[PDB]
Amino acid sequence: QVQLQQPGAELVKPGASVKLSCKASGYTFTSDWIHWVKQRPGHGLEWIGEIIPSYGRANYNEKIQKKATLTADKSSSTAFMQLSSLTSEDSAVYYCARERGDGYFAVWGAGTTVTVSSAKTTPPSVYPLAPGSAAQTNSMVTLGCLVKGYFPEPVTVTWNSGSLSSGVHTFPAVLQSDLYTLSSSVTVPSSSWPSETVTCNVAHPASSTKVDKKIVPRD
Amino acid sequence: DILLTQSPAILSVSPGERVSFSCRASQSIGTDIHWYQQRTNGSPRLLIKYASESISGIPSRFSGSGSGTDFTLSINSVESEDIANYYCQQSNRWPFTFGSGTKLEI
Amino acid sequence: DILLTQSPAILSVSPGERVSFSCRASQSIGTDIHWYQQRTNGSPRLLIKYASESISGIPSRFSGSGSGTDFTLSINSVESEDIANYYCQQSNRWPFTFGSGTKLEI
Amino acid sequence: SALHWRAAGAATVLLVIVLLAGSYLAVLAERGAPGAQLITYPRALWWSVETATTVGYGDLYPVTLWGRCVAVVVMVAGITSFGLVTAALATWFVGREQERRGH
Amino acid sequence: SALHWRAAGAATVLLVIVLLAGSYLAVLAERGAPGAQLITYPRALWWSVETATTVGYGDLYPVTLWGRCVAVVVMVAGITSFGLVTAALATWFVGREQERRGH
Ligand SMILES: CCCCCCCCCCCC(=O)OC[C@H](CO)OC(=O)CCCCCCCC
Ligand SMILES: CCCCCCCCCCCC(=O)OC[C@H](CO)OC(=O)CCCCCCCC
Ligand SMILES: CCCCCCCCCO
Ligand SMILES: CCCCCCCCCO
Ligand SMILES: [K+]
Ligand SMILES: [K+]
Ligand SMILES: [K+]
Ligand SMILES: [K+]
Ligand SMILES: [K+]
């Protein structure tokens, strides 16, 4: 089972602060240290700091401006990172990781995408993408779904609740007018659709929404 | 603070060929280097610990070597699933630090 | 005798921006480096001790980092009062020595 | 059993406790100090042993105030514990010689 | 209290005095010698302790004649002091065994 659970995203207004969480399960020892790592889009991993739950002591990266404060709750086995007075420079994915006191990060959380903006949260509109009646098919057919007008990142797109993985391409989102838009592509044997259903599931953590959209042939 | 240099930043190889990633430490760190793989939109995944120790669940395809200041992560017969960013990390001295990462291209 | 290299000798930054001064020691000196600020016609003033330790009375704006041979003095959000010459000094080995100084310009 | 043997056994148990506690505390005290190497438990346990036996190779050592304080406790515990074993051996020898002399 | 216990206590006090005096004198002897590292009091006190316990990590040590002389005094004081504690423990054990034997 998932050893470290982190919320998918957090929207924060410039100047404000937020508290990220990391719930841990599995074996736990007094020698365990929980680390936090920051990663800007397209860039490398940057160590933020660490905390030892069994004692409550925390250390931080001296090379960077201290934006975080680490704490931990033993009873709920949860580690927290308080990021305060954030700016767009603080927008990034923040990972928590577990170290058994022996130097390496055996396991990582899925990461929390933090976006520092004044814009407002907006769930996405999911539209189906089916071939036109003039489109000829081969042994395979390509379908998809358009996810537009959402904010902030990210959105997780799966096909048939995740059972359909092969032949799937989800494109990077494009930002325009304080709203993101992306599409996902799925290819299946032409002989299997629409006999066998194909649906896309779109999750938007920031708005706590997840919607499904079945892909059926055009009228 | 220990500086980990990963050069080149991008490695281009043909399918099935052997590839080697480099990580040079600014000072001697024994074998206290660990390697992580991070695929597009995924979280880092530990591949090798203490320069050459295997991790259960990782394809035998992956191996590591070196000590002191020069380390290497090698992939025998590369395949599509190996496309990702690879990072080294040291735990010899405080604070732990990460290399800048190398991208594998096929 | 330990040589402390401060380069560049002049740092130009815009108001409110973050600035970093560099001090490189000719050999490893742990964290035995201290930073001083000297304004025009004034005497030196201790800002940071033992590479990162805060001094009471100094704005939180100032911080230090590094160990071994590479050290950094950072000013978060620079302002006019920060205009001055900055010097590093080592106390790891006899005799104590000073870096050549870096001037902050806005 | 005689006092010296009980004391020796006890000293051994206490030393083991100090080595384990010292290793945990050393890492706690040293992480956060730029350049420190006594920062992972396995090697900290090794450091505690070479310190308690007073061997001190110099491969690892504390750089912070609290790490050094932990170090002094480990040193004293090792020295005193081994010294106590010597004292117990001397007591055993003295007793045996008294008997051998028919005293 | 018995002599061995009084002597042990005294030895401890004297050792503390030697560590403090040794630290002060070590800095005094070493400053002025190019390359010397035993030149600030806090770490010199740490050096005096790892020298008295004979651990000698090698992180710090004297390079001058007088610093080395100070070092020898610290070494001898530590060795003799801890040895005296061992002697006191042996005396305590011997006495207890005599009693246990009804001698
Ligand atoms: C003249 C007699 C000697 C007096 C020495 C001064 C008093 C002792 C410590 C002061 C701590 C401080 O403010 O400094 C800690 C230092 C911070 O840079 O780092 C250090 O790690 C120095 C640690 C010294 C450890 C000594 C262990 C003894 C069991
Ligand atoms: C053959 C038997 C051995 C004889 C050795 C010579 C006599 C001893 C010292 C002469 C000092 C000198 O003129 O030199 C000091 C030196 C100056 O460069 O620096 C030094 O630091 C060398 C110090 C040696 C310390 C010995 C401590 C003993 C308790
Ligand atoms: C034996 C000295 C006390 C234990 C170490 C405490 C460290 C606290 C954090 O710096
Ligand atoms: C124990 C040796 C005497 C004390 C040190 C004296 C140093 C004088 C200056 O060089
Ligand atoms: K030694
Ligand atoms: K040594
Ligand atoms: K050595
Ligand atoms: K050495
Ligand atoms: K020794």
Side-chain angles (χ1 to χ4, degrees), chain A residues 1-22 24-62 64-73 75-88 90-119 121-135 137 139-219, chain B, chain C, chain D residues 1-95 97-103, chain E residues 1-95 97-103:
Chain A
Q1 60 305 329
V2 179
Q3 310 190 203
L4 275 35
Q5 291 186 173
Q6 302 185 70
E10 293 291 321
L11 177 57
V12 184
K13 297 182 180 301
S17 63
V18 60
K19 196 183 200 65
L20 305 190
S21 65
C22 177
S25 66
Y27 288 112
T28 53
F29 308 116
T30 184
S31 55
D32 294 338
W33 289 73
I34 296 302
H35 296 252
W36 291 86
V37 173
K38 172 185 177 183
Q39 178 169 52
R40 305 292 226 62
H43 290 179
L45 305 169
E46 175 172 282
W47 188 74
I48 301 172
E50 65 191 338
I51 182 166
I52 176 174
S54 73
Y55 196 81
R57 168 66 175 300
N59 305 303
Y60 307 81
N61 185 323
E62 307 188 326
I64 65 180
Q65 312 87 298
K66 185 174 182 178
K67 284 289 187 301
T69 295
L70 311 178
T71 59
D73 189 297
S75 61
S76 59
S77 296
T78 305
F80 305 85
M81 174 170 79
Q82 179 70 59
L83 296 171
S84 55
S85 182
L86 307 179
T87 66
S88 63
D90 299 306
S91 295
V93 175
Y94 290 88
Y95 295 103
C96 56
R98 158 194 280 164
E99 184 230 342
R100 302 292 188 186
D102 46 12
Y104 57 88
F105 304 127
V107 72
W108 298 65
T112 295
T113 300
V114 175
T115 302
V116 181
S117 177
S118 302
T121 301
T122 305
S125 294
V126 186
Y127 306 119
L129 296 179
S133 189
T137 79
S139 61
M140 304 297 286
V141 58
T142 300
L143 306 173
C145 66
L146 177 64
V147 187
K148 67 181 290 70
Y150 72 81
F151 190 86
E153 279 271 59
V155 291
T156 298
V157 185
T158 60
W159 291 87
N160 283 351
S161 302
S163 62
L164 191 54
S165 175
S166 296
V168 174
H169 299 305
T170 296
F171 301 91
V174 296
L175 179 65
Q176 189 182 67
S177 184
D178 302 64
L179 294 177
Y180 289 94
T181 296
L182 67 69
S183 287
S184 181
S185 162
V186 66
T187 300
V188 299
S190 58
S191 68
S192 75
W193 179 81
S195 63
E196 299 181 55
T197 192
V198 172
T199 299
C200 77
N201 328 93
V202 181
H204 186 234
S207 62
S208 299
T209 66
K210 185 175 183 178
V211 306
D212 299 312
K213 178 67 64 176
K214 184 182 179 184
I215 307 301
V216 297
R218 297 170 66 69
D219 57 298
Chain B
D1 295 37
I2 302 177
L3 177 55
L4 270 32
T5 299
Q6 285 183 262
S7 179
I10 302 178
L11 234 39
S12 306
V13 57
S14 295
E17 197 182 311
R18 184 185 173 72
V19 68
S20 292
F21 302 84
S22 168
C23 180
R24 181 171 173 187
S26 54
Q27 52 184 280
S28 193
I29 54 166
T31 50
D32 297 328
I33 199 83
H34 317 293
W35 294 90
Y36 304 83
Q37 175 193 70
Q38 182 181 40
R39 291 179 177 120
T40 308
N41 296 308
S43 58
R45 168 196 180 196
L46 182 69
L47 297 171
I48 294 289
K49 64 181 181 178
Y50 305 104
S52 68
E53 290 182 41
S54 298
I55 302 301
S56 64
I58 302 299
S60 59
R61 186 190 324 150
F62 292 91
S63 70
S65 67
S67 71
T69 64
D70 292 295
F71 304 84
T72 304
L73 171 63
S74 292
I75 302 182
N76 210 64
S77 180
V78 173
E79 51 182 290
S80 296
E81 65 178 294
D82 299 327
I83 291 174
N85 283 145
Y86 293 81
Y87 300 85
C88 51
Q89 172 248 315
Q90 70 80 32
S91 58
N92 186 77
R93 289 180 188 272
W94 198 88
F96 292 172
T97 51
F98 288 99
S100 53
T102 291
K103 169 73 169 179
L104 177 60
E105 170 188 303
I106 302 184
Chain C
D1 295 37
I2 302 177
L3 177 55
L4 270 32
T5 299
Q6 285 183 262
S7 179
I10 302 178
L11 234 39
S12 306
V13 57
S14 295
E17 197 182 311
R18 184 185 173 72
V19 68
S20 292
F21 302 84
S22 168
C23 180
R24 181 171 173 187
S26 54
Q27 52 184 280
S28 193
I29 54 166
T31 50
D32 297 328
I33 199 83
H34 317 293
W35 294 90
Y36 304 83
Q37 175 193 70
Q38 182 181 40
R39 291 179 177 120
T40 308
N41 296 308
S43 58
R45 168 196 180 196
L46 182 69
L47 297 171
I48 294 289
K49 64 181 181 178
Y50 305 104
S52 68
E53 290 182 41
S54 298
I55 302 301
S56 64
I58 302 299
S60 59
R61 186 190 324 150
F62 292 91
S63 70
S65 67
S67 71
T69 64
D70 292 295
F71 304 84
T72 304
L73 171 63
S74 292
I75 302 182
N76 210 64
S77 180
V78 173
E79 51 182 290
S80 296
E81 65 178 294
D82 299 327
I83 291 174
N85 283 145
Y86 293 81
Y87 300 85
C88 51
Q89 172 248 315
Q90 70 80 32
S91 58
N92 186 77
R93 289 180 188 272
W94 198 88
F96 292 172
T97 51
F98 288 99
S100 53
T102 291
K103 169 73 169 179
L104 177 60
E105 170 188 303
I106 302 184
Chain D
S1 188
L3 174 69
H4 47 108
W5 294 138
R6 300 194 54 171
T12 302
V13 180
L14 192 64
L15 180 60
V16 173
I17 295 178
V18 170
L19 296 176
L20 293 177
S23 300
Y24 174 85
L25 293 173
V27 175
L28 183 64
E30 300 285 304
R31 285 195 178 198
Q37 287 185 306
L38 199 51
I39 60 184
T40 48
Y41 303 105
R43 69 192 56 191
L45 177 59
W46 159 241
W47 162 81
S48 77
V49 176
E50 46 181 31
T51 295
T53 55
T54 65
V55 169
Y57 293 122
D59 54 337
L60 294 163
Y61 50 76
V63 294
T64 68
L65 169 63
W66 295 131
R68 288 169 170 175
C69 285
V70 167
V72 177
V73 172
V74 170
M75 297 174 186
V76 172
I79 295 172
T80 300
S81 290
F82 286 103
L84 186 148
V85 167
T86 294
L89 291 175
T91 301
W92 176 46
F93 291 158
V94 167
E97 189 68 334
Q98 294 310 301
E99 295 185 52
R100 183 166 166 281
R101 293 182 177 182
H103 184 279
Chain E
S1 188
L3 174 69
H4 47 108
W5 294 138
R6 300 194 54 171
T12 302
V13 180
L14 192 64
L15 180 60
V16 173
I17 295 178
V18 170
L19 296 176
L20 293 177
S23 300
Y24 174 85
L25 293 173
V27 175
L28 183 64
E30 300 285 304
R31 285 195 178 198
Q37 287 185 306
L38 199 51
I39 60 184
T40 48
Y41 303 105
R43 69 192 56 191
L45 177 59
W46 159 241
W47 162 81
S48 77
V49 176
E50 46 181 31
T51 295
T53 55
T54 65
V55 169
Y57 293 122
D59 54 337
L60 294 163
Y61 50 76
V63 294
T64 68
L65 169 63
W66 295 131
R68 288 169 170 175
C69 285
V70 167
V72 177
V73 172
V74 170
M75 297 174 186
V76 172
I79 295 172
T80 300
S81 290
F82 286 103
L84 186 148
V85 167
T86 294
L89 291 175
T91 301
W92 176 46
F93 291 158
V94 167
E97 189 68 334
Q98 294 310 301
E99 295 185 52
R100 183 166 166 281
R101 293 182 177 182
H103 184 279

